[PDB]
Amino acid sequence: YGAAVVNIDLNRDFFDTATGIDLTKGIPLVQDLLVPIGVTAGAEQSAEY
Amino acid sequence: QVGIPKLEVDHISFSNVVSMMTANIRTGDDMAVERVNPDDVRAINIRNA
């Protein structure tokens, strides 16, 4: 009782940090895999998805 | 008759009307611009002139 909202997320226990994935934002995000060249710092972030 | 141009004849005229600015043109309000660089070098369109 009092559960305000119930989402269906990717399972962090399966997609562990050992996978390189970070799911805290609600999407998988992997640093330094695909990554644009020729862009300002912090423009790399969307590619992490 | 119309007045003869001074340069037209060989007399020297030591009084003349001289156009002039009322005060110094260099007011020190020099032009300055916000240059803003392309976000991504690869995206730039060299093409079409």
Q: Which residue in A28, A22, A29, A24 sits closest to A44, CA to CA? A: A29
Q: Which residue in A44, A17, A40 sits closest to A28, CA to CA? A: A17
Method used experimentally: cryo-EM
Q: Which residue in A14, A38, A42, A40 sits closest to A28, CA to CA? A: A14
A35 interfaces chain B, CB cutoff of 8 Å: no
Local structure of B40: helix, strand or coil: strand
Give me B24's structure tokens: 């110094």
- Partners of B40 in the β-ladder: A39
Residues 7-36 of chain B with CB under 8 A from chain A are none
> With the C-alpha atoms ordered A43, A45, A46, A47, is the resulting torsion angle positive or negative?
positive
B39 interfaces chain A, CB cutoff of 8 Å: yes
Q: A9 near A26, Cβ under 8 Å?
A: yes
